[PDB]
Amino acid sequence: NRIKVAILFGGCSEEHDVSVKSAIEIAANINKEKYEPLYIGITKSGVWKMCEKPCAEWENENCYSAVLSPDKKMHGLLVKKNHEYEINHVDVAFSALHGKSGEDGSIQGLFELSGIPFVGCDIQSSAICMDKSLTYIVAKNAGIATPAFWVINKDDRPVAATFTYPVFVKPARSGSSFGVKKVNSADELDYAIESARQYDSKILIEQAVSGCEVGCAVLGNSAALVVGEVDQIRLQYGIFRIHQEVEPEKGSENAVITVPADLSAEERGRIQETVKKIYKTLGCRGLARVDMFLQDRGRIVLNEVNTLPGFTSYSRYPRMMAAAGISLPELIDRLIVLAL
Amino acid sequence: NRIKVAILFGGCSEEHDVSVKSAIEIAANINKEKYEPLYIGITKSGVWKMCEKPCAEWENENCYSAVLSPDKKMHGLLVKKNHEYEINHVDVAFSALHGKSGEDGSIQGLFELSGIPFVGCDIQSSAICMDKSLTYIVAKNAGIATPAFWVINKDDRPVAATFTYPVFVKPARSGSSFGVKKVNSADELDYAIESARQYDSKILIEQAVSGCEVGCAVLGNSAALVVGEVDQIRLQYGIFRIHQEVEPEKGSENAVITVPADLSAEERGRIQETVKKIYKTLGCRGLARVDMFLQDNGRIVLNEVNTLPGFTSYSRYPRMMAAAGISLPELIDRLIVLALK
Amino acid sequence: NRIKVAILFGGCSEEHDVSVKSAIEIAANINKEKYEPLYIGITKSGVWKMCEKPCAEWENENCYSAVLSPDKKMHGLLVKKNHEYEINHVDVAFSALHGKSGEDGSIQGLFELSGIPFVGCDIQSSAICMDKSLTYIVAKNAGIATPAFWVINKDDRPVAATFTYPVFVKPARSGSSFGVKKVNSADELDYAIESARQYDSKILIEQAVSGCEVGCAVLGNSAALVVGEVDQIRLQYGIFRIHQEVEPEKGSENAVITVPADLSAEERGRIQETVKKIYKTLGCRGLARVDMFLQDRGRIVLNEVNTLPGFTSYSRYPRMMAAAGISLPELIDRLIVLAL
Amino acid sequence: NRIKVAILFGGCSEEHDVSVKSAIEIAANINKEKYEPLYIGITKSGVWKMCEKPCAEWENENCYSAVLSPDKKMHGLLVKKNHEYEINHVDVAFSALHGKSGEDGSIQGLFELSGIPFVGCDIQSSAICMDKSLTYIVAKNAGIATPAFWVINKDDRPVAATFTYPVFVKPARSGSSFGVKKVNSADELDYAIESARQYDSKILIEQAVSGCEVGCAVLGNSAALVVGEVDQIRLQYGIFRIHQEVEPEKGSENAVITVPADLSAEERGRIQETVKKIYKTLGCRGLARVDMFLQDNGRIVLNEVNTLPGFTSYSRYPRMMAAAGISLPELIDRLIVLALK
Ligand SMILES: Nc1ncnc2c1ncn2[C@@H]1O[C@H](COP(=O)(O)OP(=O)(O)O)[C@@H](O)[C@H]1O
Ligand SMILES: Nc1ncnc2c1ncn2[C@@H]1O[C@H](COP(=O)(O)OP(=O)(O)O)[C@@H](O)[C@H]1O
Ligand SMILES: Nc1ncnc2c1ncn2[C@@H]1O[C@H](COP(=O)(O)OP(=O)(O)O)[C@@H](O)[C@H]1O
Ligand SMILES: Nc1ncnc2c1ncn2[C@@H]1O[C@H](COP(=O)(O)OP(=O)(O)O)[C@@H](O)[C@H]1O
Ligand SMILES: [Mg+2]
Ligand SMILES: [Mg+2]
Ligand SMILES: [Mg+2]
Ligand SMILES: [Mg+2]
Ligand SMILES: [Mg+2]
Ligand SMILES: [Mg+2]
Ligand SMILES: [Mg+2]
Ligand SMILES: [Mg+2]
């Protein structure tokens, strides 16, 4: 008897497509002798459908109305396959949504109502990692260095001449680099601010952090954390934004990612231990990808924490995992077992 | 039409009983000329049902298997009638659940997915106001004083002699004083940790904060805030735990509450302004009740923020609004309108 | 029946005198209705004596040979009051030694053999906090920023022209500022190195950390940490070295200490939480004073951790404690109760 | 005179029995022309006694209530004879205790206080080599590869499925394989955590490291190091746990050890050089046995460092020295002389 895994993807969110790709690789690797996956696509306009498999043409006549119910006795989906909505049991739920709806505690809220065990972070930790400002606040309180930043509310009007350049401008709650800009001088502050506001009514302005990006993929609950190899992004210019590029699977035009990171084993361990505390400080479980800056002084600053990280074929986390000897199938399985 | 309002109540939560009470009031005051209320009760064990009305024994052979769906096109409910689930449209959602599932962003999570407009706080402010230690961290970052506290997680075994008594022990994520206790001596610490551990695997030890409790009912969305009259609780011993008492509608045994509070007009306005700053700093909307301590030194310390406050007939929030001239029919309407904004 | 508290002081150590003063204030505050203190002075040459009370003239005809025994069934002292060594029971041991012999795990080793419960840090955490290098190594591994430093072994010969000034030079294992120097330029590197070597055959050279000194007094075991108010040392020049000054009780000539620190409540909380992790990373218990640097950027660097901190009347820790509402007597009592 | 040497053995430690064995050998090889040995046994329960000699049943109505005192003028022992404690001078101390109290800097702490010269490592290197996780942290900082591991403290409850098997479970601070176990499947994890938890409130989960165990006996103080022949252990299953086996003097059931190891002269020298770097990086002196893993890739990984290695008749350390031409009478003498340096 296969464990019935609802795998949610798509979503009403600008990262919709990254999500569809995350889902296409999960589908292609989960072990189907042990798991019976139910694919729940969420369209961009927020419509829920059960389909056959995730793909770029996932929306099709064969799909049908299927939601996750909040009701604990149903513990499952309400599906319309014939002329009638029927209840189908789910053993466990693995959402692959990214960003809005998916990592911001929203889907976690339904999982919680349903009583259906699920993969990864709970509500409050998804809400804390999603709002970058909220994440710096909890991170500072635990004693984790972070960028200096200013929250720009909807009605605010920062005066540009007051900052020191460069700066980064960005939505408080997006991902995949939607709305992010390196800002080099004052007359571009506004344009950047308005762009970040296409994605959230509240945006942040960060001091630039120097150095390079070092990431750490983490797996587990509180008592025992498994980390993959540390990765490193070096940028020839601009910012990291692989999913915004044309043909991302072909390699980035401005960024080079090395794994393991080209750093001693002492430096890499250090980055991992830092990632573990960030993770514990935020109250994460299951998985998250902890992204950091490694300054030339060698000190580690938090960048952000991505709780439901990309699983695309050119994604950071599965890659960090495979390099530590955990391939995707085994990854998927341990995540599901940790949910159970 | 009238605006269809789904009113959720009960819950898989220890504040279940306070919630049914909260819902009873709301059902008795909402204006049915303007609104068509749809009552969904959730059992203590997570089962959703549409009933005619909130009451002490609301589950009846009348009550509907009925869930609010996360689907945007459905924009409403899946209701079982004739053994088949069908779609019923809803205009706005007003959750009267309290605590677990209700103030911790769980319900808000489903409301967000559904696209139905809903009353009250979003998910992150609900999560931050629900975990008391999260609220202190965020209020502190914004300049609000808070009690000193210690997070005690599930497997911790703190030595009692470490603390300076008295101390308050409590769950991180509960309400209505479930699991709360003033502990005056180390030898009582263990008892209180275990009792709190019934409502959360995580629990707080707090510095006793001196003074009296002054609360403030807040209404509005970002900026335009209305406040009620400040209320004020004096205790003869123990802690405020009115919902836990014998027949609370008849009054408290150890607590007296005054509204407006017996403080100068300038002190009251100052508390209302502190209340306001806490509200914005936490990113609340719709409503909340901001509870504080006024110390002798005149310093205002955050106690906690109750994002979906009780609406029972002896509750603090409706009573503060009412003292400011907004009685329940109206508050309800302001809340729904705010959800519709 | 009073709890019999052996209070050890003095020691074969350059901080001997600070220790005697620490002891004179403990004696003047411990509650004698609850505790029956046994004063064990250790001379500078390492001779053990039981005396009447700690004082600058503690060594006197009335004292007599008294050691702590390693034997668990004795669980006490072997005292020679008459013509014979007799065994006297001890319920608990509070050592007030500082530095060598006392905070370096040495006295903790005897406590451990004896089975007599004792105040504060165990062996490995005293050994780790004592050797500043050892402390930076464990601290880096946990992800705690520290100064950049070089271990100068006995046989090494650093070449001065290679450093960037200023630097601090210091014994790997002393305290009270014995052997410490701010070094401003290269031709003073040696003189400083030789001076630090009067106190340890291994010395360290640290990059200067900018900003000011913020300290945090911590009390407790792992599960629950009580911290006093944060303190701040600002220096008009030179280094902090109050116990090296003439007439220290009269106030320092170069340093001003504020408590609570003149910083927001957010900044102070942050320093406290950082101190808690440093403490947990090092595996401390009972008490320690965690000293940090607060950089103008606002980031917190470790300076050192002092496990058996000064209790003199002008000492940092009791002061941080009293300011948080815990006066010395209550302090002493909770430390002893935590040992028990 | 002969040099008076206090020889401590037994201990309040689970390696108590291995220690008495270690002491038996030493008493049988020390040169009594040069040295006058003074045997202090410590019971399993912490009681100190002077006896005629180390043996399986060394406690006798002959054995002395006798402690090594921390006092510098006494420079030796307080010995009970005629019901009165008296001072006996000692020249040098050689502890043959193993593990708890013996390799964790406890005994070294008393030796430091006493000013008696003593054999072996100081307090901090003993503490760092005793807590395996401490050793990995310090070796790693110095560039030595180490196993990946997880610290599991007393109240932790790790989910087993998290790990990749096989995994090694063990106490942080023990020896002789007490509490160690190769766990090949998650369902065996719990058993192994609990069994390790008998010897330490803190325990380690380690990545299985592949290859064979290659060890190295080190002799000397800072710099001038002598090393024995590299030894090498091949296992047919399970783990090396010779002291735990039936009648180990007769050999192991699952383990074969070869010395010199069956590796090129260049690989052996390289391991000895790695051994040397580990020794200095940890600040050891006197002696230690540095145990490593040689992987197929030829990489050397630290297993652990045994600061006071066993001296039984089937022990690794004496045997490595002996293969290099230094037999026990001599090693003992080199150790004492080093303590006298
Ligand atoms: N403050 C910063 N300092 C340096 N680079 C930054 C900063 N903020 C953003 N970036 C760059 O922009 C990229 C993405 O922004 P990020 O904060 O990670 O948002 P998202 O969740 O959309 O990835 C980072 O990977 C990094 O290259
Ligand atoms: N730290 C504190 N100092 C003083 N009184 C406290 C403190 N914490 C709780 N109390 C008392 O206990 C009551 C209930 O605790 P509270 O923190 O408001 O949690 P909840 O009301 O959500 O259950 C308060 O109303 C007050 O009377
Ligand atoms: N690296 C450093 N950067 C700035 N000041 C330093 C540094 N190291 C030492 N100091 C100064 O010297 C004082 C004492 O040195 P410290 O490392 O604290 O040794 P001790 O244990 O003797 O106090 C500090 O209080 C500080 O003023
Ligand atoms: N991580 C590891 N990888 C491979 N084998 C191990 C590992 N840890 C322990 N072992 C095996 O278990 C034995 C005992 O564990 P060890 O770490 O040497 O502790 P101790 O010997 O102090 O009791 C080793 O000799 C080796 O056979
Ligand atoms: Mg992101
Ligand atoms: Mg990013
Ligand atoms: Mg509450
Ligand atoms: Mg309350
Ligand atoms: Mg010091
Ligand atoms: Mg200092
Ligand atoms: Mg060992
Ligand atoms: Mg071993």
Side-chain angles (χ1 to χ4, degrees), chain A residues 1-56 58-83 85-274 276-280 282-340, chain B residues 2-59 61-274 276-280 282-340, chain C residues 1-56 58-83 85-274 276-280 282-340, chain D residues 2-59 61-274 276-280 282-340:
Chain A
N1 292 74
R2 297 202 293 172
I3 282 157
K4 286 149 77 179
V5 193
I7 293 173
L8 277 68
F9 70 97
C12 180
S13 166
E14 69 262 10
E15 287 175 93
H16 180 105
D17 291 327
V18 180
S19 167
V20 171
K21 292 183 227 200
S22 288
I24 283 166
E25 318 293 312
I26 282 136
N29 286 81
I30 185 169
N31 182 359
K32 303 173 224 340
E33 280 156 46
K34 164 176 196 176
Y35 289 116
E36 170 171 22
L38 305 189
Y39 297 104
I40 311 309
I42 300 187
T43 78
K44 299 221 224 153
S45 84
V47 168
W48 291 47
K49 283 165 183 151
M50 176 156 161
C51 304
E52 211 219 321
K53 59 190 177 140
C55 45
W58 66 274
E59 216 177 344
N60 85 53
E61 180 165 353
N62 246 279
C63 310
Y64 37 53
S65 169
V67 293
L68 222 133
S69 174
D71 184 294
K72 285 185 201 300
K73 191 175 169 175
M74 316 188 187
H75 187 117
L77 300 147
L78 274 145
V79 186
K80 213 189 188 192
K81 13 211 127 184
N82 162 44
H83 311 77
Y85 277 104
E86 91 214 317
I87 284 171
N88 295 130
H89 185 86
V90 172
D91 298 307
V92 57
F94 184 157
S95 156
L97 300 158
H98 310 298
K100 331 201 135 72
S101 105
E103 300 159 271
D104 57 358
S106 177
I107 194 62
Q108 295 73 21
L110 216 208
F111 291 166
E112 292 293 9
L113 295 156
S114 88
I116 303 162
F118 62 97
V119 169
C121 281
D122 65 2
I123 303 166
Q124 66 178 248
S125 62
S126 299
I128 75 220
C129 293
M130 233 333 247
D131 183 334
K132 293 175 169 70
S133 52
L134 186 55
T135 335
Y136 306 140
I137 295 172
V138 167
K140 327 182 158 315
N141 171 258
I144 310 285
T146 78
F149 59 101
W150 296 275
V151 178
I152 311 315
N153 289 116
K154 73 186 178 180
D155 47 322
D156 291 2
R157 322 166 157 179
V159 183
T162 59
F163 285 84
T164 256
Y165 299 81
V167 292
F168 294 80
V169 172
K170 75 187 40 165
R173 308 160 269 223
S174 181
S176 286
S177 292
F178 283 104
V180 190
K181 272 213 57 187
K182 175 158 148 151
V183 155
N184 298 317
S185 79
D187 57 301
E188 272 156 323
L189 186 71
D190 263 58
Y191 173 66
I193 281 168
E194 292 299 317
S195 172
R197 304 168 156 154
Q198 297 161 272
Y199 300 98
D200 192 333
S201 57
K202 172 177 62 142
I203 77 71
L204 277 29
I205 300 178
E206 301 184 3
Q207 207 85 78
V209 176
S210 84
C212 61
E213 290 177 56
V214 288
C216 179
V218 184
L219 168 90
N221 307 339
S222 55
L225 299 172
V226 163
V227 305
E229 304 280 324
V230 177
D231 72 355
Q232 98 184 111
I233 302 182
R234 292 115 149 185
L235 296 167
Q236 70 156 110
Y237 54 87
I239 55 143
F240 179 54
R241 54 193 283 290
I242 189 67
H243 298 290
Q244 311 288 340
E245 301 181 58
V246 321
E247 276 284 16
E249 24 323 85
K250 273 187 188 75
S252 170
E253 305 290 293
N254 66 151
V256 176
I257 303 172
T258 305
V259 208
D262 185 17
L263 289 178
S264 68
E266 183 228 73
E267 203 166 29
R268 290 201 274 105
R270 226 168 92 224
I271 295 162
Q272 296 168 339
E273 288 321 289
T274 296
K276 279 137 107 194
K277 322 306 295 202
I278 290 172
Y279 191 98
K280 285 133 135 220
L282 302 176
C284 288
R285 62 146 38 204
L287 78 175
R289 195 186 75 246
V290 185
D291 302 340
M292 282 158 309
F293 295 115
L294 176 63
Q295 295 170 349
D296 298 319
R297 95 207 272 200
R299 303 196 185 143
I300 298 163
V301 181
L302 206 211
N303 159 38
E304 60 154 4
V305 170
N306 295 100
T307 47
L308 206 290
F311 287 78
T312 81
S313 71
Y314 48 92
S315 277
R316 308 172 56 186
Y317 179 103
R319 187 160 66 221
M320 282 177 280
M321 291 293 191
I326 308 166
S327 322
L328 229 212
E330 249 237 296
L331 229 192
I332 299 190
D333 180 45
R334 308 196 185 166
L335 286 171
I336 283 167
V337 169
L338 265 8
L340 308 134
Chain B
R2 289 179 296 153
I3 291 159
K4 319 273 194 346
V5 192
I7 302 176
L8 280 56
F9 72 94
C12 169
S13 166
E14 66 276 10
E15 308 175 79
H16 181 105
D17 302 321
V18 172
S19 168
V20 163
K21 303 196 179 162
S22 284
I24 284 153
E25 300 311 296
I26 294 154
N29 297 75
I30 193 173
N31 174 353
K32 346 223 90 149
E33 268 171 343
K34 180 166 199 181
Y35 304 106
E36 176 184 9
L38 298 178
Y39 301 112
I40 322 272
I42 301 176
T43 67
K44 292 186 181 176
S45 71
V47 183
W48 289 52
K49 286 153 186 166
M50 181 149 103
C51 301
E52 135 192 75
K53 72 161 155 65
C55 47
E57 280 111 14
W58 61 278
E59 273 179 279
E61 197 19 43
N62 270 338
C63 276
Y64 314 5
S65 170
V67 293
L68 195 151
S69 163
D71 192 286
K72 300 211 208 269
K73 193 133 134 183
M74 312 191 188
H75 191 119
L77 318 181
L78 285 181
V79 192
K80 190 220 222 137
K81 49 266 260 260
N82 271 90
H83 334 274
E84 292 334 318
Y85 286 96
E86 72 170 81
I87 301 181
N88 299 175
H89 175 275
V90 161
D91 297 302
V92 56
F94 181 175
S95 170
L97 307 162
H98 292 307
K100 274 145 222 153
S101 85
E103 286 170 281
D104 55 11
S106 184
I107 197 49
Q108 293 83 17
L110 205 201
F111 296 160
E112 302 281 11
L113 291 164
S114 73
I116 301 140
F118 60 88
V119 158
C121 291
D122 54 19
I123 300 167
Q124 80 184 67
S125 58
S126 291
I128 49 215
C129 293
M130 191 80 201
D131 180 345
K132 294 174 166 79
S133 58
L134 191 48
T135 325
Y136 298 141
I137 285 166
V138 177
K140 148 99 108 166
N141 171 86
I144 308 303
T146 67
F149 64 99
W150 297 262
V151 174
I152 300 288
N153 292 95
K154 203 156 174 196
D155 310 296
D156 291 336
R157 319 160 76 129
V159 172
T162 316
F163 306 108
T164 293
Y165 294 76
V167 108
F168 291 75
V169 168
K170 73 189 78 167
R173 294 158 284 215
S174 187
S176 295
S177 316
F178 287 97
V180 183
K181 170 190 154 194
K182 183 185 174 154
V183 2
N184 311 290
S185 82
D187 32 294
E188 346 203 40
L189 203 77
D190 283 7
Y191 188 72
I193 291 168
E194 307 302 309
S195 138
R197 293 183 161 147
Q198 308 162 267
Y199 307 91
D200 193 334
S201 71
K202 186 172 58 145
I203 81 86
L204 277 28
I205 300 175
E206 298 179 10
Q207 296 279 165
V209 162
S210 81
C212 72
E213 304 177 39
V214 296
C216 189
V218 181
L219 215 214
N221 293 349
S222 73
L225 285 22
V226 154
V227 283
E229 289 292 322
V230 181
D231 82 353
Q232 143 175 62
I233 303 156
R234 294 127 137 204
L235 292 178
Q236 85 145 136
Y237 59 78
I239 63 160
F240 182 66
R241 51 177 286 277
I242 188 68
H243 297 294
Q244 301 304 331
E245 290 188 68
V246 171
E247 300 296 290
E249 4 256 298
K250 280 169 212 191
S252 176
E253 294 295 295
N254 65 128
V256 166
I257 291 213
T258 298
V259 213
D262 193 18
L263 301 173
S264 77
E266 140 182 333
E267 210 151 34
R268 277 199 270 103
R270 207 190 110 233
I271 292 180
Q272 288 169 325
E273 283 294 314
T274 288
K276 271 152 37 163
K277 158 168 215 213
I278 285 160
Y279 189 92
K280 296 152 158 159
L282 300 168
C284 296
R285 90 190 284 99
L287 78 166
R289 192 190 74 242
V290 180
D291 291 346
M292 295 153 274
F293 304 99
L294 179 53
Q295 282 179 345
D296 300 331
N297 321 110
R299 176 184 196 101
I300 298 149
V301 188
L302 209 202
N303 163 39
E304 54 138 16
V305 174
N306 312 92
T307 243
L308 195 102
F311 287 84
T312 79
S313 73
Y314 47 99
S315 280
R316 299 175 62 188
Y317 182 115
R319 167 163 66 230
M320 279 189 274
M321 282 300 162
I326 314 180
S327 67
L328 208 41
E330 178 177 6
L331 211 211
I332 285 175
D333 181 63
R334 277 162 174 268
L335 282 157
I336 297 172
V337 162
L338 270 50
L340 291 178
Chain C
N1 292 74
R2 297 202 293 172
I3 282 157
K4 286 149 77 179
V5 193
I7 293 173
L8 277 68
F9 70 97
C12 180
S13 166
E14 69 262 10
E15 287 175 93
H16 180 105
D17 291 327
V18 180
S19 167
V20 171
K21 292 183 227 200
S22 288
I24 283 166
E25 318 293 312
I26 282 136
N29 286 81
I30 185 169
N31 182 359
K32 303 173 224 340
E33 280 156 46
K34 164 176 196 176
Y35 289 116
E36 170 171 22
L38 305 189
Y39 297 104
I40 311 309
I42 300 187
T43 78
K44 299 221 224 153
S45 84
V47 168
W48 291 47
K49 283 165 183 151
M50 176 156 161
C51 304
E52 211 219 321
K53 59 190 177 140
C55 45
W58 66 274
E59 216 177 344
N60 85 53
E61 180 165 353
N62 246 279
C63 310
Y64 37 53
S65 169
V67 293
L68 222 133
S69 174
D71 184 294
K72 285 185 201 300
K73 191 175 169 175
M74 316 188 187
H75 187 117
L77 300 147
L78 274 145
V79 186
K80 213 189 188 192
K81 13 211 127 184
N82 162 44
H83 311 77
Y85 277 104
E86 91 214 317
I87 284 171
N88 295 130
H89 185 86
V90 172
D91 298 307
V92 57
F94 184 157
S95 156
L97 300 158
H98 310 298
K100 331 201 135 72
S101 105
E103 300 159 271
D104 57 358
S106 177
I107 194 62
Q108 295 73 21
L110 216 208
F111 291 166
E112 292 293 9
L113 295 156
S114 88
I116 303 162
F118 62 97
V119 169
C121 281
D122 65 2
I123 303 166
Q124 66 178 248
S125 62
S126 299
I128 75 220
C129 293
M130 233 333 247
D131 183 334
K132 293 175 169 70
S133 52
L134 186 55
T135 335
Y136 306 140
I137 295 172
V138 167
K140 327 182 158 315
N141 171 258
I144 310 285
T146 78
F149 59 101
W150 296 275
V151 178
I152 311 315
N153 289 116
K154 73 186 178 180
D155 47 322
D156 291 2
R157 322 166 157 179
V159 183
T162 59
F163 285 84
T164 256
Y165 299 81
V167 292
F168 294 80
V169 172
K170 75 187 40 165
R173 308 160 269 223
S174 181
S176 286
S177 292
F178 283 104
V180 190
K181 272 213 57 187
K182 175 158 148 151
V183 155
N184 298 317
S185 79
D187 57 301
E188 272 156 323
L189 186 71
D190 263 58
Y191 173 66
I193 281 168
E194 292 299 317
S195 172
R197 304 168 156 154
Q198 297 161 272
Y199 300 98
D200 192 333
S201 57
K202 172 177 62 142
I203 77 71
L204 277 29
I205 300 178
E206 301 184 3
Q207 207 85 78
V209 176
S210 84
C212 61
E213 290 177 56
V214 288
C216 179
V218 184
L219 168 90
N221 307 339
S222 55
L225 299 172
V226 163
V227 305
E229 304 280 324
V230 177
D231 72 355
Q232 98 184 111
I233 302 182
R234 292 115 149 185
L235 296 167
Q236 70 156 110
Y237 54 87
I239 55 143
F240 179 54
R241 54 193 283 290
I242 189 67
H243 298 290
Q244 311 288 340
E245 301 181 58
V246 321
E247 276 284 16
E249 24 323 85
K250 273 187 188 75
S252 170
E253 305 290 293
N254 66 151
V256 176
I257 303 173
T258 305
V259 208
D262 185 17
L263 289 178
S264 68
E266 183 228 73
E267 203 166 29
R268 290 201 274 105
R270 226 168 92 224
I271 295 162
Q272 296 168 339
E273 288 321 289
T274 296
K276 279 137 107 194
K277 322 306 295 202
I278 290 172
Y279 191 98
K280 285 133 135 220
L282 302 176
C284 288
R285 62 146 38 204
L287 78 175
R289 195 186 75 246
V290 185
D291 302 340
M292 282 158 309
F293 295 115
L294 176 63
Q295 295 170 349
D296 298 319
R297 95 207 272 200
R299 303 196 185 143
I300 298 163
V301 181
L302 206 211
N303 159 38
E304 60 154 4
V305 170
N306 295 100
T307 47
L308 206 290
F311 287 78
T312 81
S313 71
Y314 48 92
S315 277
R316 308 172 56 186
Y317 179 103
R319 187 160 66 221
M320 282 177 280
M321 291 293 191
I326 308 166
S327 322
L328 229 212
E330 249 237 296
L331 229 192
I332 299 190
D333 180 45
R334 308 196 185 166
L335 286 171
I336 283 167
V337 169
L338 265 8
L340 308 134
Chain D
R2 289 179 296 153
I3 291 159
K4 319 273 194 346
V5 192
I7 302 176
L8 280 56
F9 72 94
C12 169
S13 166
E14 66 276 10
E15 308 175 79
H16 181 105
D17 302 321
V18 172
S19 168
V20 163
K21 303 196 179 162
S22 284
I24 284 153
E25 300 311 296
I26 294 154
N29 297 75
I30 193 173
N31 174 353
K32 346 223 90 149
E33 268 171 343
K34 180 166 199 181
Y35 304 106
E36 176 184 9
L38 298 178
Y39 301 112
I40 322 272
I42 301 176
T43 67
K44 292 186 181 176
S45 71
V47 183
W48 289 52
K49 286 153 186 166
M50 181 149 103
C51 301
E52 135 192 75
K53 72 161 155 65
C55 47
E57 280 111 14
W58 61 278
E59 273 179 279
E61 197 19 43
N62 270 338
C63 276
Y64 314 5
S65 170
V67 293
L68 195 151
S69 163
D71 192 286
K72 300 211 208 269
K73 193 133 134 183
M74 312 191 188
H75 191 119
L77 318 181
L78 285 181
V79 192
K80 190 220 222 137
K81 49 266 260 260
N82 271 90
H83 334 274
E84 292 334 318
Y85 286 96
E86 72 170 81
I87 301 181
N88 299 175
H89 175 275
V90 161
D91 297 302
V92 56
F94 181 175
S95 170
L97 307 162
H98 292 307
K100 274 145 222 153
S101 85
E103 286 170 281
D104 55 11
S106 184
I107 197 49
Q108 293 83 17
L110 205 201
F111 296 160
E112 302 281 11
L113 291 164
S114 73
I116 301 140
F118 60 88
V119 158
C121 291
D122 54 19
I123 300 167
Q124 80 184 67
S125 58
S126 291
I128 49 215
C129 293
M130 191 80 201
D131 180 345
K132 294 174 166 79
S133 58
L134 191 48
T135 325
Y136 298 141
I137 285 166
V138 177
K140 148 99 108 166
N141 171 86
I144 308 303
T146 67
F149 64 99
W150 297 262
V151 174
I152 300 288
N153 292 95
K154 203 156 174 196
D155 310 296
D156 291 336
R157 319 160 76 129
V159 172
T162 316
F163 306 108
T164 293
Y165 294 76
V167 108
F168 291 75
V169 168
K170 73 189 78 167
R173 294 158 284 215
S174 187
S176 295
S177 316
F178 287 97
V180 183
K181 170 190 154 194
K182 183 185 174 154
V183 2
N184 311 290
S185 82
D187 32 294
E188 346 203 40
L189 203 77
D190 283 7
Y191 188 72
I193 291 168
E194 307 302 309
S195 138
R197 293 183 161 147
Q198 308 162 267
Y199 307 91
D200 193 334
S201 71
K202 186 172 58 145
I203 81 86
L204 277 28
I205 300 175
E206 298 179 10
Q207 296 279 165
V209 162
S210 81
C212 72
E213 304 177 39
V214 296
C216 189
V218 181
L219 215 214
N221 293 349
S222 73
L225 285 22
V226 154
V227 283
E229 289 292 322
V230 181
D231 82 353
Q232 143 175 62
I233 303 156
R234 294 127 137 204
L235 292 178
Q236 85 145 136
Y237 59 78
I239 63 160
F240 182 66
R241 51 177 286 277
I242 188 68
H243 297 294
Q244 301 304 331
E245 290 188 68
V246 171
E247 300 296 290
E249 4 256 298
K250 280 169 212 191
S252 176
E253 294 295 295
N254 65 128
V256 166
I257 291 213
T258 298
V259 213
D262 193 18
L263 301 173
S264 77
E266 140 182 333
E267 210 151 34
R268 277 199 270 103
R270 207 190 110 233
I271 292 180
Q272 288 169 325
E273 283 294 314
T274 288
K276 271 152 37 163
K277 158 168 215 213
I278 285 160
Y279 189 92
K280 296 152 158 159
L282 300 168
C284 296
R285 90 190 284 99
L287 78 166
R289 192 190 74 242
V290 180
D291 291 346
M292 295 153 274
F293 304 99
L294 179 53
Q295 282 179 345
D296 300 331
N297 321 110
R299 176 184 196 101
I300 298 149
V301 188
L302 209 202
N303 163 39
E304 54 138 16
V305 174
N306 312 92
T307 243
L308 195 102
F311 287 84
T312 79
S313 73
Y314 47 99
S315 280
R316 299 175 62 188
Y317 182 115
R319 167 163 66 230
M320 279 189 274
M321 282 300 162
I326 314 180
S327 67
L328 208 41
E330 178 177 6
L331 211 211
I332 285 175
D333 181 63
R334 277 162 174 268
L335 282 157
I336 297 172
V337 162
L338 270 50
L340 291 178

